[PDB]
Structures are given as C-alpha cells and as structure tokens.
Amino acid sequence: TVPVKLKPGMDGPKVKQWPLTEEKIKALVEICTEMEKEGKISKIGPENPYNTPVFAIKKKDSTKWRKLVDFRELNKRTQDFWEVQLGIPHPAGLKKKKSVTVLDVGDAYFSVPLDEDFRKYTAFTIPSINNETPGIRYQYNVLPQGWKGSPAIFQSSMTKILEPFKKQNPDIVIYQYMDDLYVGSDLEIGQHRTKIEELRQHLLRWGLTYELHPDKWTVQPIVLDIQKLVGKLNWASQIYPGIKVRQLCKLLRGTKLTEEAELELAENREILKYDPSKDLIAEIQKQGQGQWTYQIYQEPFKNLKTGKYARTNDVKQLTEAVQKITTESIVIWGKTPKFKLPIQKETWETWWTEYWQATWIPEWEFVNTP
Amino acid sequence: IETVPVKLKPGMDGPKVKQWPLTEEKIKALVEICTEMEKEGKISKIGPENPYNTPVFAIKKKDSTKWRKLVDFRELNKRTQDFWEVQLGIPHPAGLKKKKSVTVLDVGDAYFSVPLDEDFRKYTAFTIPSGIRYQYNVLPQGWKGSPAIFQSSMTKILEPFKKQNPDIVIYQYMDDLYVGSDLEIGQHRTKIEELRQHLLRWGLTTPDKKHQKEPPFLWMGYELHPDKWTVQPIVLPEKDSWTVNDIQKLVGKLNWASQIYPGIKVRQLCKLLRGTKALTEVIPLTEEAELELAENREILKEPVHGVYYDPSKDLIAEIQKQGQGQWTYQIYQEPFKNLKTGKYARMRGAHTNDVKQLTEAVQKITTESIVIWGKTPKFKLPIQKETWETWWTEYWQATWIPEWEFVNTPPLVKLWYQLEKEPIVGAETFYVDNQKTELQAIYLALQDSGLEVNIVTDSQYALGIIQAQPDKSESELVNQIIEQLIKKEKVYLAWVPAHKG
C-alpha cells in the first residue's frame, strides 16, 4: 500500500464525458462488466465528485474492442510528483539502435491493488445513448491501468523480473512508458525478432503478462518567378544564418549578379550540413494533402527535430501523424510532446476517439481565435 | 430505507438560523403541519442541544392547497459537498421509439422514502418560532444534491426489475417513471402491476391518479402522442405580484423551457436577484423580463411535431440557407417529417463565411445526432462536390465533413472566387500603387478586358489582414473580388516577400 499523495491543496479530475457512438457504448458496457467481475473496479454513487472519460477503440488490424481510460489531470498532479519519488530515467543510446519494438503489456501495471487511499479520485463514466438511461460510473480500487503513475509503482516488479532478460542480451536498452515497452536492437533483424519472441515467452512464463526504425531518418534542411522563394528564405532565416540575400533588393522599386546567385547555391550546401527544464511542443502544418509538416520545439529558436510526414480524409492522416510523432518524441527526449493541431476543436473531437492505436494520450492545445 | 453516505464538504461551518414569524395564524399552521408528519414517519423530535438550524419561511403561496411546508435550503446548498450530476440533459423524445403500451407513473412521496445519513441529519434542522426543534430524517426537497441521491436510490431499487426481464424498457428522469412495453396494454397491466408491487416492497408511493393510459401523456411538456412528439403549449403564466419563491420557480421553468425552446436570458433573471434568502418578498418585473416573456411567447408559438426514431432506417440530415446566417437543419428519416427541426447559427456572421460555416453546421448536426439517436446521418448538403474538393486539398487548416449528397437550392454559399487553380503570374498592369488597401488595385482592374492586376499594397492597422484574405465580415472589397474573378482569368495577388529584410 504505497501512499499516493498528490499536490497539496488542489482538487482532482472533473472532466465531463462527450457522447459517442452506440456501438462504443455496447463495448464499454461489456468491458466494464468484465472489470467488475475481475474485481479491479467498483461502482460509486453521486457522493464522488471526481470523473474521467472512457473510450472504446478497435485493435490494430483486429475486431477486438479495447476500453481505454484517458485523463490528464491526475497525470498532471500525481505522476509528475512520482517523478521525484519514483522517477524513470531515459536512455541515451536508444537513438543509435537499428530498430525499436513497441509492445503493449497486458494488465501488468494494474496487477497490484495497493493504492486505495486516494482511490476516490479515479472514476470513469459510461453514459446512455440519449441521456435517458441514468449514467453508470465506476471507480478504481487497483493501480490505475492506462495511467502514467502505474509504471512508477510497478517499476520494482519490472526491475526484479527483467534481470534474466538483461543477462541474455545486455546490449538491448529498454525505457518503459505508461503501458508500453521500448526495446532497442542494433545487431540485425533476425536476432531482433528472435529476442522479441523470447521476450513474449518470458512475459508469458513468469506471469508478467509495429517497430519504429530510428536513425534511418534525420532532419530535413530547407530547399532554395523566383521572387517568392526568397520569402521562404525570410521564413527560416532565423533557423540558419548562412543565407545573405541582400543583393537582390536593389533594382526592385518597380516590377518590369553571379555573386548573389552563388548565395542560393550556398543555401544548397546547408542541405548537406532535451533539457528537462521545459517540455516539448509539436506543431503540424497541412501544406497539401499527402505531405504534412511536423516540428518539435523546446524553445522557438531551437528546432529539436524538423520533419515532414508523407504517406481518405484529413482527420485520419493527422491522427496517424500524431501517433507517429509521439512515438518519435518519446525516444529522443524522455517525455511525451504537447501537440498543436491545425484542426477545428469539435470537428477533431467528433472522430478522433473512433480510431487510435495507442494507449498513451498526449497533451494538446488546439489553436483558437481570441 | 436504504442508507446512503452523504457528507459535508471538508472544513465548512454548518447552517445557522435567523428566522422571524410572518403571521399569527402562520405559527399555528406550521405547528400543525410539522406535527402531522411528526406523528408520521417523515421526521422526528430532537432536543435543542444542536445550535445549528436553517431559517424557515413557509407560506400559503397557492390557495389551491390548504397549506404547505416550504423550508429554505439555499443557505445550506452553499455549505454542502458538491455532488456529481448523473446526466446533463433531458431525454429528447426522438430517442424514444414509437411504442405500443406507454404508461407514465409518477411518484409523490419519493423524497419521503429515501433516508438521510447521520451527518446531514443534524444540519437540516427547522424550528417553528415562539420553538420546538426537529431534524429532517429523509431526503429533503430543495437540498442541493437531492436529485442525484434520488436518482441513485431509484436505480438501486429498479435494477432488479431491469435485470429480471429486460424485454421492456424502463426510463426514469425528473421524478417520473416512464415504462413503454412492446406488448399490448392488456399484458401491460400485469407487468405494471408487478412493477407497482416491486415498488411496494421498498415503501415507495405510486398514486393511482398518476397512472396514465390516455394518448396525451404530459410529463415535461412533451405530449407523447402515438406518432408525434407535439410539445404541449406551455402556458407560462405571469402574476403581478411575483413572490421570490415563485421567482425561483419561474427561473427553473425558464431553464427547463430553454432546454427545448432557446431562451437567452432564462438564467440571467436569476443572476439579477441574489442574496434573497427570505422566501417572502414582492419583486417587480423588469423591462427585460417582459422582453423574455414576449420571446417565450414567440418561440413557444410553434409546437414542434415529429415522428419517433425507427431503428431500421438511417437518418438523412439537410441544412437550408434560409438567410444570411440563418440555416435550418431538418433531420428526417422518411420523407415529409421534421424530427428535430431547429433554428441554427444565430448571429454567426455578418456576411458569407465561405464553406467553413457550412462545415460547422454539419458538425453541429452530427454530435447532436449522436446524442439523440446514437448514429451518424448521411448529409444531403446542396452545393456541388467541385467546390468542396477545391476546398478540400487547398485549405489551410485541415477540416473534414462526414459525407455529402446532391440537392439543389437557389441561395448558394459558393463565393465564386479563386475556384480554379490560379496561374502563378499573369500579364499584370503597372501603376503607382482597412479593406481599402487592396480595393484600389481591385477596382483598377477591368472586368471586361480580362487582364488582371496584382500589386501588393500596405496600410496601417491591417497588415495581417492584407496578408490574409478574410471573408467573415461584409466588405465592398468582397463585391469587387466577386465581380472581378467572374468572366476573367484567375487573379492571384502577390504577397510581400521582404527582399529588403
């Protein structure tokens, strides 16, 4: 029974549920009755003033629905406090790895029922279709699954269990995050999925129960009726100070030399050539269908990774982009990014819950007019 | 008498009483009123050792009833644990399918069967002036979290009946228990008798008069006719001398009416009058009060009619641009019915806000749809697909409308500006050169010649607007750009590239 005490003199979660599809209601009802039969969950009445939404998403290329409880206020008040008590360090050599496997563990973090002293804070609500049948609520008396605080407590179990795996192959570097598992392999693909199979076997036998390819891609420097392209040089002049295009300004007072031209060629040779104080902020720009742009920032001047995403409808492409960018951001700097999207708040809210293949929900703040 | 845990908010002082008698006969009337339920099981006699009570201002506000017990709990509502609402909105009848046997039971002494926890028992203490001291032993009306506690108790009582036979549907809200059975009324009699006996086990009261079989079922202004959810005309009477208790009644009725018939100031009238703890006071009406009276005369003038939802078929929504910023969205399933017709986008914009507004409209349907029917409609929006596909790949902030269809309506939100993929440059015309900034060049361009002019110009206090192309407000520049792009090649204005720096 680890004492879980959050920020002094502050409230908890009070986020209201947003109604969704009727099939989602069926799936969530089935999974909540399953949870009640398992005992990890317990109904509460109106005496509990704390709430959290709950969603139901289809599995990756599978029809098995999965219930996902997503919230940010308890992660904002409790988990960041765990970062002092039982914080998790990030790996430095994980970037150099040839391939990194992302695996979802099954109910491992919700296995220890110890935190009942604050359990009145966690609660998720399943409403009716028409606000007609009374809404049914449930309360966690076990370590919250799908919560960033669960890895902190289950860290001792992971450390005690992973040791034989470490002995078999110490070169693999791991950094668990929420309900994930990021193993790093650098030798070759065959031994990589051999070790993956061994990892699933270890997961099954001891009761503990897509792969991104880092370093295959890096930052993309900029490129370059040619009067408008100079404006692009003004857009990113702060990023790279090499360009000097002051020569072209002359003889321009009215619309109607080898040195300055070489300067653009100099831009061409610029094509060839993290601090936990502040968190990450991601911005995505549309720039035509099939080609999005994502930029991860720590400060406005520093661009930790400039990137562009290329691979229907606008919402699905942006959602998949957000997933990929989050899996990229977790590796390199240790914390989930704070997204910004060029999408209407409620338009995005309509269907983003219907399809998302991740157990981790990133903080985002949509841009809105003042 | 199922126990329920309810506690005061931490570190809060209990209620305090400062009460005065109103009339000499009022004292004895209140004594008789309290003694009747005291010898009944509702309340019990307690000693005066508790120094906390709440002021009482019960009055014979209505002559139809001989006497009533009105106790102020607005002070204790400030000092209580803020519970969590069970559900936000009243069920829209569109969710209720057309049923075969519909009966609306109503419970009268529901607040007199649910007990109250020991914590609040000492707090809800009322005294009759010139006084014997009582504490309120059951769930009290006017208590801030009373609806949620009553709903939870009702669900606890009703769950065995829901689980023993789930063929029928039982919907409970607003202290009334609706049951609609697919079986005939004759077999409904046995099932409803079983339900009444079930509620007899737990001591609740279901008056015989409240049982309804006649087609006009009125529960919250929704006449549940066999096939049309006609809203009964809510009379909403007005009296010259508005008592304050009637003022809170009027505010509650205003919000409950605005839930279906939009009312701007329904909550604002309550905000006008605050701190009026005493339940006996005369409140003159304001001019805005009469404005809201006329407003609810106007909106309630049309009683909505609609055929209930049918699971077999799919919704078909449509938005008609009946005005500039006035779009009527009809959601029909079969032809010739307005299931959830409503006025939308009131004062959304001065002028044509491109197709974005339409997009918003679409969304403002679909979410409402998923709240009322648990589905998503296949929209039948008028304008041709070509406009939305030139607006799909070429728009700045990605936005997705669910679907589209082919319908024709004269007033088209199409703005006819820059529809086709414009050429990068043209044979512009040179010249020496706040929506007036571009307006110079725009009017300099000739609509008959076909040649286009594109020279960027800057002006104070509108630099960001110049780089932009806003259409949210009505400008004569919009008229010029509309009349210029038509019967000519595409016009692509140049933007400041900052060669200087």
Coordinates of N, CA and C in Angstrom, one line a residue, chain A residues 195-282:
Chain A
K195 N 14.8 -12.2 -30.3 CA 14.7 -11.6 -29.0 C 13.3 -11.2 -28.7
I196 N 12.5 -10.7 -29.6 CA 11.1 -10.4 -29.4 C 10.3 -11.6 -29.0
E197 N 10.5 -12.7 -29.7 CA 9.8 -13.9 -29.4 C 10.2 -14.4 -28.0
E198 N 11.5 -14.3 -27.7 CA 12.0 -14.7 -26.3 C 11.4 -13.8 -25.3
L199 N 11.2 -12.5 -25.6 CA 10.6 -11.6 -24.7 C 9.1 -11.9 -24.4
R200 N 8.3 -12.3 -25.5 CA 7.0 -12.7 -25.2 C 6.9 -14.0 -24.4
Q201 N 7.9 -14.9 -24.7 CA 7.9 -16.2 -23.9 C 8.2 -15.9 -22.5
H202 N 9.1 -15.0 -22.2 CA 9.4 -14.6 -20.8 C 8.3 -13.9 -20.2
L203 N 7.5 -13.1 -20.9 CA 6.4 -12.4 -20.4 C 5.3 -13.4 -20.0
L204 N 5.1 -14.4 -20.8 CA 4.1 -15.4 -20.5 C 4.5 -16.3 -19.4
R205 N 5.7 -16.8 -19.4 CA 6.1 -17.9 -18.5 C 6.2 -17.5 -17.0
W206 N 6.7 -16.2 -16.8 CA 6.9 -15.8 -15.4 C 5.7 -15.0 -14.9
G207 N 4.6 -15.0 -15.6 CA 3.4 -14.3 -15.2 C 3.4 -12.8 -15.3
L208 N 4.4 -12.2 -16.0 CA 4.4 -10.8 -16.3 C 3.3 -10.3 -17.2
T209 N 2.8 -11.2 -18.0 CA 1.7 -10.8 -19.0 C 0.4 -10.7 -18.2
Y210 N 4.1 -2.8 -34.6 CA 5.0 -2.1 -35.5 C 6.2 -1.7 -34.7
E211 N 7.3 -1.6 -35.4 CA 8.6 -1.3 -34.8 C 9.2 -0.1 -35.6
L212 N 9.4 1.0 -34.9 CA 10.0 2.2 -35.4 C 11.5 1.9 -35.7
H213 N 12.0 2.6 -36.7 CA 13.4 2.4 -37.1 C 14.2 3.7 -37.0
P214 N 14.7 4.0 -35.8 CA 15.4 5.3 -35.6 C 16.7 5.3 -36.4
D215 N 17.3 6.5 -36.6 CA 18.5 6.8 -37.3 C 18.4 6.5 -38.8
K216 N 17.3 5.9 -39.3 CA 17.0 5.8 -40.7 C 16.6 7.1 -41.3
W217 N 16.1 8.0 -40.5 CA 15.7 9.3 -40.9 C 16.2 10.4 -40.0
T218 N 16.5 11.6 -40.5 CA 17.0 12.7 -39.8 C 16.3 14.0 -40.2
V219 N 16.8 15.1 -39.7 CA 16.2 16.4 -40.0 C 16.4 16.7 -41.5
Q220 N 15.4 17.4 -42.0 CA 15.3 17.8 -43.4 C 15.6 19.3 -43.6
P221 N 16.8 19.7 -44.1 CA 17.1 21.1 -44.3 C 16.2 21.6 -45.5
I222 N 16.1 22.9 -45.5 CA 15.2 23.6 -46.5 C 15.8 23.5 -47.9
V223 N 15.0 23.9 -48.9 CA 15.5 23.9 -50.3 C 15.2 25.3 -50.8
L224 N 16.2 25.8 -51.6 CA 16.1 27.1 -52.2 C 16.1 28.2 -51.1
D225 N 10.1 34.5 -61.7 CA 9.1 33.9 -60.8 C 9.8 33.3 -59.6
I226 N 11.1 33.7 -59.4 CA 11.9 33.2 -58.3 C 11.8 34.3 -57.1
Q227 N 11.0 35.3 -57.3 CA 10.9 36.3 -56.2 C 10.2 35.8 -55.0
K228 N 9.3 34.9 -55.1 CA 8.6 34.4 -54.0 C 9.4 33.4 -53.1
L229 N 10.3 32.7 -53.7 CA 11.1 31.7 -53.0 C 12.1 32.4 -52.0
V230 N 12.4 33.7 -52.3 CA 13.2 34.5 -51.3 C 12.4 34.7 -50.1
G231 N 11.1 34.8 -50.2 CA 10.3 34.9 -49.0 C 10.4 33.6 -48.1
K232 N 10.6 32.5 -48.7 CA 10.8 31.3 -47.9 C 12.1 31.4 -47.2
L233 N 13.1 32.1 -47.8 CA 14.4 32.3 -47.0 C 14.2 33.3 -45.9
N234 N 13.2 34.2 -46.0 CA 12.8 35.0 -44.8 C 12.1 34.2 -43.7
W235 N 11.4 33.2 -44.1 CA 10.6 32.4 -43.2 C 11.6 31.6 -42.2
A236 N 12.7 31.1 -42.7 CA 13.6 30.3 -42.0 C 15.0 30.9 -41.8
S237 N 15.1 32.2 -42.0 CA 16.4 32.9 -41.9 C 16.9 32.8 -40.4
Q238 N 16.0 32.8 -39.4 CA 16.4 32.7 -38.1 C 17.0 31.3 -37.8
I239 N 16.5 30.3 -38.4 CA 17.0 28.9 -38.2 C 18.4 28.8 -38.6
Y240 N 18.7 29.2 -39.9 CA 20.1 29.1 -40.4 C 20.5 30.5 -40.9
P241 N 21.6 31.1 -40.3 CA 22.0 32.4 -40.7 C 23.0 32.5 -41.8
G242 N 23.2 31.4 -42.5 CA 24.2 31.4 -43.6 C 23.8 32.2 -44.8
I243 N 22.5 32.3 -45.1 CA 22.0 32.9 -46.3 C 22.2 34.4 -46.2
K244 N 22.6 35.1 -47.3 CA 22.8 36.5 -47.4 C 22.2 36.9 -48.7
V245 N 21.0 37.4 -48.7 CA 20.3 37.7 -50.0 C 20.0 39.2 -50.1
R246 N 20.8 40.0 -49.5 CA 20.6 41.5 -49.5 C 20.9 42.1 -50.9
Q247 N 21.6 41.3 -51.8 CA 21.9 41.9 -53.1 C 20.7 42.1 -54.0
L248 N 19.8 41.2 -53.9 CA 18.6 41.2 -54.8 C 17.6 42.3 -54.5
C249 N 17.8 43.0 -53.4 CA 16.9 44.1 -53.0 C 16.9 45.3 -54.0
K250 N 18.1 45.5 -54.5 CA 18.3 46.7 -55.4 C 17.6 46.4 -56.8
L251 N 17.3 47.5 -57.5 CA 16.6 47.5 -58.8 C 15.3 46.8 -58.7
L252 N 14.5 47.0 -57.6 CA 13.3 46.3 -57.3 C 12.1 47.3 -57.1
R253 N 12.4 48.6 -57.1 CA 11.4 49.6 -56.8 C 10.3 49.6 -57.8
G254 N 10.5 49.0 -59.0 CA 9.4 48.9 -60.0 C 9.5 47.5 -60.7
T255 N 8.4 46.8 -60.7 CA 8.4 45.5 -61.4 C 8.5 45.7 -62.9
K256 N 9.2 44.9 -63.6 CA 9.4 45.0 -65.0 C 8.9 43.7 -65.7
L257 N 26.0 39.8 -60.7 CA 24.8 39.0 -60.5 C 25.1 37.6 -60.2
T258 N 26.3 37.2 -60.6 CA 26.7 35.8 -60.3 C 27.1 35.6 -58.8
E259 N 27.4 36.7 -58.1 CA 27.7 36.5 -56.7 C 26.5 36.1 -55.9
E260 N 25.5 37.0 -55.9 CA 24.3 36.7 -55.2 C 23.7 35.4 -55.5
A261 N 23.7 35.0 -56.8 CA 23.2 33.7 -57.2 C 23.9 32.6 -56.5
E262 N 25.2 32.7 -56.3 CA 26.0 31.7 -55.6 C 25.5 31.6 -54.2
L263 N 24.9 32.6 -53.6 CA 24.4 32.6 -52.3 C 23.3 31.5 -52.1
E264 N 22.4 31.5 -53.1 CA 21.4 30.4 -53.1 C 22.1 29.0 -53.2
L265 N 23.1 28.9 -54.0 CA 23.9 27.7 -54.0 C 24.5 27.4 -52.6
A266 N 24.9 28.5 -51.9 CA 25.3 28.3 -50.5 C 24.2 27.7 -49.7
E267 N 23.0 28.1 -49.9 CA 21.8 27.5 -49.2 C 21.8 26.0 -49.5
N268 N 22.2 25.6 -50.7 CA 22.2 24.2 -51.1 C 23.2 23.5 -50.2
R269 N 24.4 24.1 -50.0 CA 25.4 23.4 -49.2 C 25.0 23.4 -47.7
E270 N 24.0 24.1 -47.3 CA 23.4 23.9 -46.0 C 22.5 22.7 -45.9
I271 N 22.1 22.2 -47.0 CA 21.3 21.0 -47.0 C 22.1 19.8 -46.6
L272 N 23.3 19.7 -47.1 CA 24.2 18.6 -46.6 C 24.6 18.7 -45.1
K273 N 24.8 20.0 -44.7 CA 25.1 20.2 -43.2 C 24.2 21.2 -42.6
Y274 N 15.3 18.4 -25.0 CA 16.3 17.5 -24.4 C 16.6 17.9 -23.0
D275 N 16.6 19.2 -22.7 CA 16.7 19.7 -21.3 C 15.4 19.6 -20.6
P276 N 15.3 18.9 -19.5 CA 14.1 18.7 -18.8 C 13.5 19.9 -18.2
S277 N 14.1 21.1 -18.3 CA 13.5 22.3 -17.7 C 12.2 22.6 -18.4
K278 N 12.0 22.5 -19.7 CA 10.8 22.7 -20.4 C 10.4 21.5 -21.2
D279 N 9.1 21.3 -21.4 CA 8.6 20.2 -22.1 C 8.6 20.5 -23.6
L280 N 8.2 19.5 -24.4 CA 8.2 19.5 -25.9 C 6.9 20.1 -26.4
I281 N 6.9 20.9 -27.5 CA 5.8 21.4 -28.1 C 5.8 21.1 -29.6
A282 N 4.8 20.4 -30.1 CA 4.8 20.0 -31.5 C 3.8 20.8 -32.3

